[PDB]
Amino acid sequence: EDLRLHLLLNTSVTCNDGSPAGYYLKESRGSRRWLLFLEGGWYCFNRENCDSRYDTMRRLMSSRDWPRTRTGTGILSSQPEENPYWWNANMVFIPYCSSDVWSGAEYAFMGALIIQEVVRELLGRGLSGAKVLLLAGSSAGGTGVLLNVDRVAEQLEKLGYPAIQVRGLADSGWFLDNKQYRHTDCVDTITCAPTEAIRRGIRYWNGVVPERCRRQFQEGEEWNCFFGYKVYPTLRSPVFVVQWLFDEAQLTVDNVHLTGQPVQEGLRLYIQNLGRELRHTLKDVPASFAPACLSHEIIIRSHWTDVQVKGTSLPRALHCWDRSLHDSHKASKTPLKGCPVHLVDSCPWPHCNPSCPT
Ligand SMILES: [Cl-]
């Protein structure tokens, strides 16, 4: 049995082209665990970029061609073999059709409002009884978790459901605002430094960021809050960070294009340093799983059970983190103690970890 498509009842909340937004749900009435997954797939930051994205990647701007069902995979699978600890959860997949990194409140950009509305609807479909809501996402979805997790928590508190413990899982959503390897002029989504892209995007989307983070940067420089290492310290909700040290999307936005052939020296240096700098941004994030691999996303992939860091698989790391937080309480000195933490590779090159996926 698959997750089932539901289109949002409030007609005013929509995808980019005005088609209604929605979510896929597979219910598990015997569980009080809920997993809400935010899909990724870039963004567009002006009319011409978005026109071009409407022609090439229409699925990411529209619900028109969404199938009625989706099989749950990886962390959204209900098979124990594929999802050893959380197979019995209530599963929600929220398609990305807002092109705005889940920040939005001609084309409509409503990503933040979509999430708000999904949560509101799920309260009437069993979520009012939950013990745990894990807000998870990959790529622009991972970044969306960072931008939305505290707002979801506040939304539930304010609606009078304070007992639902809200945590986040951000997969492939932790990027460096470093220099590119080779400067491009902001022309395309792939020819634009992430810093410039988000700065234009925010204004074009009327994007919002977490309030606490917004206050720590100059007025009008909210784009900082899209970068994990800047926003993470200001987060109230515990967030588990899953991040390949050599993320393909990070390479892409730094204008590195691999042929697979031997890499020149200037580019060897870039790669060595990316891994080093990424390791540095994570040194004070104990809920971290960061393998030395060149890849992109993991948590809804079927093979997410096969990657290991320091002898620990990702499902297990997550299950230990989640369980120990859940039982913890204000008197707890060290909540994560006895969990494997700081699961960050130190080796210096893509695939130095033998368990990387192909
Ligand atoms: Cl897969």
Residues in the chain: 358
How far away, in angstroms, is 304 Cα from ligand 1 center? 8
The C-alpha atoms of residue 231 and residue 49 are separated, in whole angstroms, by 27
The number of C-alpha atoms within 13 Å of 301 and in the hemisphere containing its C-beta is 17
N- to C-terminal Cα separation, the chain? 28
69 φ/ψ sector (left φ>0, alpha ψ -120 to 50, else beta): beta
Among 32, 165, 144, 44, which residue's Cα sits nearest to residue 95? 144
Resolution, expressed in angstroms to one decimal = 2.2
The C-alpha atoms of residue 167 and residue 30 are separated, in whole angstroms, by 21
Active site residues: 139, 247, 296
What six digits make up the tokens of 313? Answer: 């698989």
For residue 272, what are the contacts with CB-CB under 8 A and spacing of at least 6? 348, 349
How far away, in angstroms, is 72 Cα from ligand 1 center? 10
How far away, in angstroms, is 233 Cα from ligand 1 center? 32
How far away, in angstroms, is 298 Cα from ligand 1 center? 9
How far away, in angstroms, is 203 Cα from ligand 1 center? 35
The C-alpha atoms of residue 268 and residue 276 are separated, in whole angstroms, by 12
Domain span at residue 338 reads 1-358
The C-alpha atoms of residue 265 and residue 187 are separated, in whole angstroms, by 27
What's the domain count of the chain? 1
Angle at 98 between CA 127 and CA 176, to 5 degrees: 95
The C-alpha atoms of residue 56 and residue 41 are separated, in whole angstroms, by 13
How far, CA to CA in Å, does 241 sit from each of 53, 67, 91, 165, 290?
Answer: 29, 30, 20, 18, 8
The number of C-alpha atoms within 13 Å of 175 and in the hemisphere containing its C-beta is 31
Among 317, 174, 321, 146, which residue's Cα sits nearest to residue 245? 174
Q: Could you give the dihedral angle defined by the CA atoms of residues 74, 257, 144 and 117, in that order, rounded to the nearest 10 degrees?
A: -80
For residue 234, what are the contacts with CB-CB under 8 A and spacing of at least 6? 210, 212, 213, 216
Residue that the structure tokens 């749950």 belong to: 72
Among 95, 127, 135, 134, which residue's Cα sits nearest to residue 111? 95
How far away, in angstroms, is 307 Cα from ligand 1 center? 13
Exposure class string for 238-265: b at 16+ Cβ within 10 A, else e: bbbbbbbbbbbbbbbbbbbeeeeeeeee
Report residue 218: phi and psi, to 5°: -50, 145
For residue 81, what are the contacts with CB-CB under 8 A and spacing of at least 6? none
Residue that the structure tokens 């986040």 belong to: 168
The one-letter amino acid at 117? E
How far away, in angstroms, is 130 Cα from ligand 1 center? 28
Residues bordering ligand 1, an ion, CB closer than 5 Å: 73, 301-302
How far away, in angstroms, is 263 Cα from ligand 1 center? 29
The one-letter amino acid at 251? L
How far away, in angstroms, is 300 Cα from ligand 1 center? 7
Contact 122, 164 (CB under 8 A): no
Contact 180, 254 (CB under 8 A): yes
Beta-bridge mates of residue 134: 35, 167
Neighbours of 346 (CB within 10 A): 12
The one-letter amino acid at 226? F
What six digits make up the tokens of 262? Answer: 């031997």
3-state secondary structure string across the chain? CCEEEEECCCCCCECCCCCECEEEEECCCCCCEEEEEECCCCCCCCHHHHHHHHHHCHHHCCCCCCCCEECCCHHHCCCCCCCCCCCCCEEEEECCCCCCCCCECCCCCCHHHHHHHHHHHHHCCCHHHCCEEEEEEECHHHHHHHHHHHHHHHHHHHCCCCCCEEEEEEECCCCCCCCCCCCCCCCCCCCCCHHHHHHHHHHHHCECCCHHHHCCCCCCCHHHHHCHHHHHHHCCCCEEEECCCEEHHHHHHCCCCCCCCCCCHHHHHHHHHHHHHHHHHCCCCCCEEECCCEECCCCCCHHHHCCEECCEEHHHHHHHHHHHHHHCCCCCCCCCCCCCCCEECCCCCCCCCCCCCC
How far away, in angstroms, is 205 Cα from ligand 1 center? 31
Contact 178, 194 (CB under 8 A): no
